[PDB]
Every structure is written in structure tokens, then in C-alpha cells.
Amino acid sequence: IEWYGPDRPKFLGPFSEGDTPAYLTGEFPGDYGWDTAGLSADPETFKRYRELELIHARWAMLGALGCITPELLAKNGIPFGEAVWFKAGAQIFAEGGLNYLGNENLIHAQSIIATLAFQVVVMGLAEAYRANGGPLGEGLDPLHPGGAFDPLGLADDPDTFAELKVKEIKNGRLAMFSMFGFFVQAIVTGKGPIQNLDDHLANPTAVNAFAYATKFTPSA
Amino acid sequence: KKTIREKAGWWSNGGNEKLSAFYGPDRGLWLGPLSGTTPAYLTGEFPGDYGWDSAGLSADPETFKRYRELELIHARWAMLGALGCITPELLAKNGTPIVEPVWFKAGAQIFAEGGLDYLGNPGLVHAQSILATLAVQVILMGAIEGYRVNGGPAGEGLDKLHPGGQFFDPLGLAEDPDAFAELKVKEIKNGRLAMFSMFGFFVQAIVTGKGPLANLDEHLASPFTSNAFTYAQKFTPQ
Amino acid sequence: EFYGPNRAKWLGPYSENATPAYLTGEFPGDYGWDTAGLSADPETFKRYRELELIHARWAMLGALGCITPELLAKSGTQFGEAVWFKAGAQIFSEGGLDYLGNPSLVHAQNIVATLAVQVILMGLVEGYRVNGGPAGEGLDPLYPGESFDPLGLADDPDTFAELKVKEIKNGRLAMFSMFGFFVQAIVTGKGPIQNLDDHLSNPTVNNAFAFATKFTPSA
Ligand code: CHL
Ligand code: CHL
Ligand code: CHL
Ligand code: CLA
Ligand SMILES: CCCCCCCCCCCCCCCCCC(=O)OC[C@H](CO[C@@H]1O[C@H](CO)[C@H](O)[C@H](O)[C@H]1O)OC(=O)CCCCCCCCCCCCCCCCC
Ligand SMILES: CC1=C[C@H](O)CC(C)(C)[C@H]1/C=C/C(C)=C/C=C/C(C)=C/C=C/C=C(C)/C=C/C=C(C)/C=C/C1=C(C)C[C@H](O)CC1(C)C
């Protein structure tokens, strides 16, 4: 395994030698040679698309975590009102309000306007500092700053920094694909994805996705 | 100058202006005479060039050849779809006992009691499990679609869109240069027509929920009452 | 401001490096927002500028054509049907499509003939946009002039560029408003000035969060 250069692990393996793009060399992390749609021909579109991919990846990682750890954590102990992720916004409208750990003494969140207003105000300057400038650094790598973001300092040697970049982008593409799976298997079942996992593990042959295949057929 | 039998096109030997209307700058365009500025990269050397890149997505030539690949593959898939959507309904109106001949409900036939009878016959396919069907589909399609991009047992160094060797042109219609260049634009025009018609199949299945041949019969019976506008009130937001 | 390298940008004070190098301030409303890089190629930039201004003018025309029957329902005429996502059903009524509630003014019956006359006029006037015609011939396809400006407000080029950036800013606000009309028609089911009447009745409950629950699957 190399993850760079011309002999890299590619998305079709043996079927990837004639498909492989001429604009897609072995430079950037995660380049499996997959631009069959042709959307990275000029390098600044590829730069904005790599930035888009890494930001969507790093958001979908924490999105999958905030998806399954309420449901798994409610399965272990610590019961909630609406433990599933895609009813989790409805806990503001509850008579007891959204709570972080469910207990009544933490936050007492009854307002949706205050939370949304505060997070918009703080993330305006946060994502603006992400775009350019900021007190933690201005002219760094805009996708991989480091410095005031690395208390442990795992970007010391360029070899382990490069392999951390490729496992970052691979875990993030897995998280984006699985978050797409969370999105679609929420709406075809109406039930939680960990509860979908136990439903699949109870009956693998007939409680799979194909039981919900006749659901979306149009009426009349 | 020109006599009557040449204007009808009796003699297929002296036809050299046949590709002049589909290739080169003096070809037909998308808005006809109401399309003056053809995009300067769509020079007409490719089949299906009606000068239409209004959204400008195909200015770069690499993106343009990838979009040409996607267009021809989607064209052939939609051609096979629009032939394979109506023909169960055509054979059900024939009298062959297909039990759910509409295409948008044919996938649920494998969840029946007797499985998936192919032409309504247990002597045919009679597939029960959707799981082994999708498994052999993903194995066979992985092999075929991986052979497609970089060659394989049916041609290795051939063209990625038009191989035409001993396996993909076995009848040999594309031996001639001009006949191949004419049937290329014939192929992509029939494929764009079938892509438009498959989009029509999708929207017709969504908003009506009946068969496309049932939609054709309900438009042939009442054209002015049973148009697309009598189902325009079906997505009103209450 | 509004042109050149020292113009108004989309992040404002935090917009000195995120703006792309190919978005130089010569085209109207160049706030430097190409965060997906889709207009990096100049032909993509020109075609997307054409799509943006045409979508802009169609959106502002659609915004006024959607809200003015609502303001006239406030004013006092009843039309055939005031609600813009139920406005196409006037031609399906028994009395037909009366324009201002007047049965002797339009009284349209056939929706198929309305679509036929509509496509026969609109295909011609949309194909005339590309390569001139009776109005113009070979002008700027985004800013023709000389037949669609009977008053002719494009005399001074500084005021012309000012009106250009004013047009494209009103147009981005208009597509914003039409997207809002689209996604608050489907979640509420009431007209947009009627949603304004709800939000002015009680401002803290008649929000989008009153209807933020209705799109859960729930088996
Ligand atoms: C040699 C065999 C081989 C095959 C068959 C594949 C298969 C694939 N790999 Mg690959 N790989 C292979 C070798 C290898 N891969 C990888 C590592 C990777 C990675 C990291 C990735 C891939 C990805 C892909 C996909 C890219 C093409 C595509 O998008 O399909 C398009 C066609 C389909 C997806 C059809 C299959 C689905 C199904 C049959 C149809 C569904 C029908 C629905 C019912 C219709 C929907 C209903 C409507 C109403 C919405 C494809 C599925 C990419 C991927 O996972 O994308 C999802 C990807 O990110 N591979 C390695 C390690 C180096 C390989 C080693 O040899
Ligand atoms: C000179 C007159 C002339 C006109 C007006 C057109 C018109 C058109 N041709 Mg062209 N052609 C013309 C001459 C010629 N064409 C062709 C050969 C072709 C081909 C091969 C193709 C075209 C296509 C097109 C379309 C390209 C633009 C588009 O996609 O519009 C799209 C927008 C509209 C059509 C308007 C929207 C429809 C409706 C009126 C409004 C919406 C109504 C709904 C009720 C809205 C409700 C929906 C809600 C829910 C959202 C356009 C309709 C392409 C096509 O068919 O694309 C569809 C195409 O592939 N033409 C030749 C032979 C050389 C011509 C010779 O003179
Ligand atoms: C200094 C602070 C400052 C910041 C941080 C921004 C940044 C912004 N400006 Mg701005 N500007 C700022 C000052 C100025 N601007 C401008 C001129 C402009 C213009 C002309 C424009 C902007 C626009 C924008 C927006 C572009 C990014 C975006 O689309 O949001 C992306 C992030 C989100 C959408 C997150 C939304 C928040 C919330 C989480 C949503 C809730 C999520 C849902 C619940 C989930 C959905 C559920 C399911 C069902 C799908 C953003 C708010 C553009 C705009 O308005 O686009 C909309 C625009 O056209 N600015 C000027 C004049 C010089 C400024 C003065 O200083
Ligand atoms: C990689 C993350 C991941 C994981 C762990 C799961 C796991 C699961 N999904 Mg989710 N899903 C995913 C990704 C994932 N899916 C993605 C990317 C999509 C979008 C296409 C979906 C869409 C989806 C729907 C719509 C549904 C599920 C369901 C399920 C459950 C039953 C399995 C099933 O029906 O197959 C569905 C699997 C897919 C559609 C594709 C997933 C990709 C896999 C990893 C590749 C196939 C490998 C497989 C082991 C070999 C199959 C052999 C043969 C059948 C072809 C199971 C818990 C069902 C459920 O809730 O059960 C109760 C259900 O209704 N999933
Ligand atoms: C140079 C070599 C050229 C080879 C060309 C390919 C020849 C292919 C021959 C047909 C093979 C199909 C068999 C598929 C598996 C079936 C297994 C099975 O269970 O069978 C079971 C079936 C019987 O099963 C019956 O099927 C019927 C179909 O309607 C009914 O439904 C009955 O109810 C059912 O009992 O047995 C057969 O049909 C075997 C017949 C094979 C020969 C058919 C006549 C063909 C003779 C001419 C061949 C022409 C070749 C050129 C044309 C093709 C060009 C590509
Ligand atoms: C040109 C241009 C130009 C400008 O400038 C810009 C723009 C506008 C962007 C552009 C345009 C574009 C377009 C139009 C697109 C479209 C497409 C389509 C429609 C496709 C289809 C597509 C379609 C398709 C694929 C289809 C396919 C089909 C298939 C597979 C099959 C199916 C089937 C069948 C048999 C039946 C059974 O039962 C089942 C199934 C399975 C269901």
C-alpha cells in the first residue's frame, strides 16, 4: 500500500487502468481515480471540491457519532424521551425540554430561537475564520491548519501526517456514505438505525431493505 | 439542375450531404434558426451536436468527453428501459398472463407466493429470492461494467464507447465510415428520445400511478379531459 | 465599492482570501462567492451569469405575480382564486379564469389552448433572445438595450453599472424570496402574505418551527 503515486490503490482495482484520469495524479489523499463524471478537470475546481469533500467528511463523522451514540447510549442505560436522532429536534417542544444527558438539572432547553440565534452568531465568525484569517492563524493550509488545533501534535513527520490524511479522508468518505444510509433508512422505516440493526440481526433474510421496497409505490 | 429522383433520394451512392446536416458547422441546431451563437467548443465533430450547452457544463474538453460517455451510457440504458417498460404491458394486452405488467410494480413480483414468473410461466425463470438475484446481478454487472472501461474478453484496446469488434458489432452494420458516422447520430438521437421518454415514465408513474400504456389509452379515449392537467391538482400543498 | 478589487464582498471584513482570484470586479454583483468553483472556467462564468440574470428577472416577475393577488385580496377584489399555488385551478372552475374577478375580461376555459398559445409566444420570444430579431440584432444577450428601454436608463455608464448591480442584487433577493415561497408553500399550505398575517398575528408561535415536525416518516 502506498496511497500516493501512480501505483495507488484504486476504486476498481484491476478495472481501473483505462478509466483513470490524466488530470488525477497520485498527489492528494484518497485519490482512487474516481472522476467518471468528469468534475475535476481544472485544478481549482478540484481544490474547491477537495475542500468540499473534507468539510463534508469531517461534518459527517461527527454527524454519524451524534446519530448513533444517543441510541446506543439509551440502549445501554440513561433513558431519554425521544432517544432516536431524527426526532431529536422535537425535544425542544417537549413539556420538559431537551436535556443533554436527560436529567432535569443540566440545561432546561425550552427555546429553539435562542439556540439557533446563538449558533448562527458564533458560527458566522467561526466559519469566517475557517475561510480566511482568524486568531489561530491566517495563511496556513486551509484544509489542514494544525498549530492551535493540535494539542497533541500528530502532524510531526510528513509520512505519518500523509497517512493520517489518507485515513482521515477514508474514514470521512465512509462516514458520508453511512450518513447517506442513515438519511435514507430513516425515511423508509421511520425507525432508528440501531433499531434497524437489531431488526436486521433478528431476521436477516426478510427484515432487510427489501421489506420496505413496496412502500414508496405511488397510489391511484 | 437536379431532377426529381435525386430530390427524392433514389440513389444512395451519391449521398455525400447526409452528414452535412448532422456534422460540421452547416448542421441543424437546437433552436434552429433561433440559435445563432453556437458554443465554440461544440464544433459538430461528435454525434448529436445541436449546439446546446446553455448551462455551459461542457466547456472543458475532458468534462465534455466524460459527459459524452455518460450521455451515451444513459442513452443506451434508457433505450433498453423504454423498450423494457412497455413490452410487459404490450404482452399483457396481448394475452400473455403477466400478473403485474406495469414497470413500476414489477419489482414486487418477486415477493409473491410463486416468485417471479418470467412470462407468467413457472416453466420459466421462477426466481423466488430477491437476495440471490441481486447478488448474481452485482457480480455479473461488476464483471461487465469493469470490463467496460479498460477492456476484457470482448475487446481490450478498443474505443470506450464504440468498441464494435466481433462481439459488439457482430452483424457488421458499422463497417462503412459514413454509415457508422450516420448511425452514431441516429443512436444518440434515439437515445435522447428514450431518455426523455424514461423521464416521462418516471413522472407519469409518480403523479398518476397507472401504466404508461394505460396512460396512453386514457389519453386516446379522452384527450382533452384526461391530459396531464387533470393530474396537476395532485401535489397541492394543504 | 461594488466593483474592483476593493468592492463589497460576501463575507465582508473576513473576505480577503476566500474570494477566488478569477472573480475580478467587472461584472455586476461580483461579491466573490464561488465556494464550489463552478464558474472557474470563463465560459462557465458567462453561462452562469446568463442563467443568474435570467433566473433573477424571472424570479422578480414571479414574486410580484405571486404576491399582487394577495395584496389585492387584502384590497378587496376576489379574482377566481388568489392563492398562487392554487391559482392554476381558476381555469378548471365553472366560470373560468376571470382576470380581476371580471367575467368579461379573460374568461379562459381551455388550459390546453392556454399552454399552446403560451408556448407559441414564449418559444419565439425565447429564441429571439439568442440571435436578435425584430427587437434587436447582435447586442449583448444579457443587456440588449435600444428596444426594451423606451425610457433608456442606460445612458451614463457609471449609473448603468450602478443599475446593473442594483438589478442583480434585487434579483438575488428575488430568487431568495421565490425559494422561500416554494418551501413555505409546501410546509404551511397558506399563501405568503397569509403567512405574513400569521407571523404578524403572533410572532413567536407562527414561525417555521411550528411546522418543523410534519416531515418525519414515522413508519
Ligand atoms: C474488481 C472488482 C471491483 C468492483 C466490481 C468494485 C465496485 C465498485 N467500487 Mg471498488 N470495486 C472493485 C475493486 C476495488 N474497489 C476498491 C475500493 C473502492 C473505494 C474506496 C470505492 C470503491 C467504489 C466502487 C464503486 C464505483 C463504481 C460505481 O459507482 O458503481 C455504480 C453502480 C452501482 C452503485 C449499482 C449497484 C447498486 C444496485 C445494484 C442498484 C440499486 C438499484 C436500486 C433499487 C434503485 C434505486 C431506487 C430509486 C427509486 C432511487 C463500485 C460499486 C466507490 C463506492 O463505494 O461508491 C459507492 C468507492 O468510494 N471501491 C478496492 C481497494 C483498492 C478494489 C480492489 O480491487
Ligand atoms: C425555431 C423554433 C424552435 C424552438 C422554439 C425550439 C425549442 C426547443 N428545442 Mg429545438 N426548437 C426549435 C427548432 C429546432 N429544434 C430542433 C431540434 C431539437 C433537439 C434534438 C432538441 C431540441 C430541444 C429544444 C429545447 C431546448 C431548450 C429547452 O430545453 O427548454 C426547456 C424549457 C421549456 C420547454 C419550457 C418549460 C415548459 C412549459 C411551457 C413551462 C412549464 C409548464 C408546467 C405546467 C410547469 C409546472 C411544473 C412545476 C411543478 C415545477 C427547446 C424546447 C431539446 C429538447 O427537446 O429539450 C427538452 C432537444 O434535445 N430541439 C431542430 C432540428 C434541427 C429545429 C429546427 O428548426
Ligand atoms: C461579517 C460577517 C459576515 C458573515 C460571516 C457573512 C456570511 C454570509 N453572507 Mg454575507 N456575511 C457577513 C457580512 C456581509 N455579507 C455581505 C454581503 C453578502 C451577499 C450579497 C450575500 C451574502 C451571503 C452570506 C451567506 C453565505 C454563506 C451561506 O450561504 O450560508 C451557509 C450556511 C447555512 C445556510 C447555515 C444556515 C443556518 C442554520 C443552521 C440553518 C438551519 C438548518 C435546517 C434546520 C436544516 C434543514 C433541514 C432539512 C429538512 C433539510 C452567509 C450568511 C449570501 C447569501 O445570502 O446566501 C444565503 C449572499 O448572496 N453576504 C456584506 C456587504 C459587504 C457584509 C458586511 O459585512
Ligand atoms: C456502510 C454502512 C451501512 C451499514 C452498516 C448499513 C446497515 C444496514 N442498513 Mg443501510 N444503507 C447504507 C449503508 C449502510 N447500511 C447506504 C449507503 C444506503 C444507501 C443506498 C443504505 C440504505 C438502506 C435502506 C434503504 C435500508 C437499509 C437497511 C439496513 C439494515 C439491513 C441491511 C439491508 O437491508 O441492506 C441495505 C443495504 C444497502 C441498500 C446498501 C448498503 C451497502 C452495503 C455495505 C454493500 C452490500 C454488501 C452486502 C453485505 C452484500 C450484499 C450481497 C447481495 C445481497 C447483493 C442494516 C442494519 C434497511 C433497514 O432498515 O433494515 C431494517 C433499510 O430499509 N439501509
Ligand atoms: C455456435 C454456437 C451457437 C449457440 C447459440 C446459442 C444457442 C442457445 C440455445 C437455447 C439455450 C437456452 C437454454 C437456457 C437454459 C434453460 C435450462 C432449462 O431448464 O431448460 C428448460 C427448457 C424447457 O422448459 C420449458 O420452457 C418453456 C419456455 O416457454 C415453457 O415455459 C415450459 O413450460 C417449460 O417446461 O428446455 C429447453 O427449452 C431447451 C431447449 C433448447 C433449444 C431450443 C431451440 C433452439 C434451437 C436453435 C438454436 C438457435 C441458435 C441461434 C440462436 C441464438 C443466437 C444467440
Ligand atoms: C443537454 C443539456 C444542455 C444544457 O446546456 C444543460 C442541461 C439542461 C443540463 C443539459 C440537459 C440534460 C438533460 C436533459 C438530462 C436528462 C437526462 C435524462 C432524462 C436521462 C434519463 C435517463 C433514464 C434512464 C437512464 C432510464 C433507464 C431505465 C432502466 C435502467 C431500466 C429500467 C427498468 C425496466 C426495463 C422496467 C423494469 O420494470 C424495472 C426497471 C429497472 C425500472
First and final C-alpha spacing in chain C: 54
Give the three-class secondary structure for A102: coil
CA pair distance A135, A129, nearest whole angstrom: 8
Query: Which superfamily is assigned to B60-209 in CATH?
Result: Chlorophyll a/b binding protein domain (1.10.3460.10)
The grid coordinates listed for B37 are 451563437
Do the Cβ atoms of A83 and A70 come closer than 8 Å?
yes
Cα–Cα distance for residue pair C176/B195, rounded to 1 Å = 32
- Structural domain of C183: 9-212
Contact A19, A36 (CB under 8 A): yes
Q: Is A28 left (phi over 0), alpha (psi -120 to 50) or beta?
A: beta
CB A35 within 8 A of CB A12: no
**A60 contacts A172 by C-beta, under 8 angstroms:** yes
| DSSP states along C4-44 | STTS--SSGGG-SSSS-TT--TTSTT-----TT-TT-SHHH
Is B229 in contact with C111 (Cβ distance < 8 A)? yes
Whether the CB-CB separation of A149 and A141 falls below 8 Å is answered with no
Q: Are A193 and A81 in contact (CB under 8 A)?
A: no
Domain boundaries, chain A: 10-213
Question: Domain for residue C152, yes or no?
Answer: yes
- DSSP state letters, C61-81: HHHHHHHHHHHHHHHT---S-
Nearest to A207 by CA among A198, A216, A215, A217: A198
Amino acid code (one letter) for C146: E
> Cell numbers 478495472 label which residue?
A15
C-alpha cell at B1: 439542375
Q: Where are the domains of chain B?
A: 1-54, 60-209
d(CA C219, CA C217): 6
Q: Is A49 annotated as a binding residue?
A: yes
Residue C77 lies in a domain: yes
Resolution, angstroms, 1 dp: 3.5
Q: How far is CA C166 from CA C46, C171, C172, in A?
A: 19, 8, 10
In this complex, which chains have at least 3 CB pairs below 8 Å with chain C?
A, B
Check if C7 has its Cβ closer than 6 Å to any atom of ligand 3.
no
Reference B120, options B83, B94, B156, B143; nearest CA is: B94
Residue A167 counted as an annotated binding residue: yes
In total, chain B counts a number of residues equal to 238
Check the CA dihedral A203-A204-A205-A206 and report its sign: positive
Per this entry, what is the length of chain C?
219
Nearest to A24 by CA among A43, A11, A2: A43
State the Cα–Cα distance between residues A183 and B71, nearest whole angstrom: 29
Contact between B91 and B98 (Cβ < 8 Å): yes
Shortest alpha-carbon distance between residue C13 and chain A (Å): 9
Angstrom CA distances, B237 to C78, C84, C137, C188, stand at: 21, 11, 44, 8
Is residue C108 within 8 Å of residue C114, measured between CB atoms? yes
Contacts of A198 (CB under 8 A, 6+ apart): none
- State the amino acid at position B228 in one-letter form: A
Q: How many other C-beta atoms can be found within 10 angstroms of the C-beta atom of residue B155?
A: 16
Residue in A60, A42, A41, A62 with CA at minimum distance from that of residue A52: A60
Is C218 contained in some domain?
no
Q: Distance between the two ends of chain A, CA-based, in angstroms?
A: 55
Residue A12 in contact with ligand 1 by CB distance below 6 A: yes
State how far the Cα of C158 lies from the Cα of C143, in Å rounded to an integer: 15
**B152 phi, psi to nearest 5 deg:** 170, -145
Distances (CA, A) of A94 to A86, A108, A109, A111, C202: 15, 10, 9, 10, 20
**Rg of chain A over all Cα atoms, to the nearest angstrom:** 22
Query: In the numeric block, which cell numbers belong to residue C82?
Result: 388568489
Mapped onto helix, strand or coil, the DSSP state of residue C140 is coil
CB C10 within 8 A of CB C34: no
Q: How far is CA B231 from CA B67, B208, B235, in A?
A: 34, 7, 8
Subunits with 3+ Cβ pairs within 8 Å of A are B, C
- Got the DSSP string for B77-99? HHHHHHHHHHHHHHHHHHT---S
Q: Using the mean position of ligand 3's atoms as its centre, give its distance from the Cα of residue A129 in Å.
A: 14
Distances (CA, A) of C173 to A142, C56, C168: 30, 8, 8
Q: Provide, as residue numbers in chain A, all residues whose Cβ is less than 8 Å from the Cβ of B205.
A: 218
Helical H segments across A80-216, by residue range: 113-131, 158-187, 193-202
Distance CA B65, CA B85 (A): 29
Give the DSSP letter of residue C104. Answer: T
Cell 449521398 sits on residue:
B15
Cβ neighbours around B103 below 10 Å, total: 20
The sign one gets for the Cα dihedral B220, B223, B226, B227 is positive
Q: What domain count does chain C have? A: 1
C-alpha to C-alpha distance for B1 and C56, rounded to whole angstroms: 53
Method: cryo-EM
The answer to whether the CB of B168 falls within 8 A of the CB of B47 is no
Are B234 and B204 within 8 A, CB to CB? no
DSSP secondary structure code for residue A26 in this structure: S
User: Which residue of B41, B63, B111 to mutate against A (max A Cβ within 10 Å)?
Assistant: B63
Cα-to-chain-centroid distance, residue C128: 21
In short, whether C95's Cβ falls inside 6 Å of ligand 2 is no
DSSP chain A: --SSSSS---TTGGGGSSS--SS--S-STT--S--TT----SHHHHHHHHHHHHHHHHHHHHHHHHHHHHHHHHHHS---SS-SGGGGGGGTTSSS-B-SSS-TTS--B--SHHHHHHHHHHHHHHHHHHHS--TT-SSS-SS---STT-SS---SSHHHHHHHHHHHHHHHHHHHHHHHHHHHHHHTTSS-HHHHHHHHHH-TTTSSGGGGSSSS----
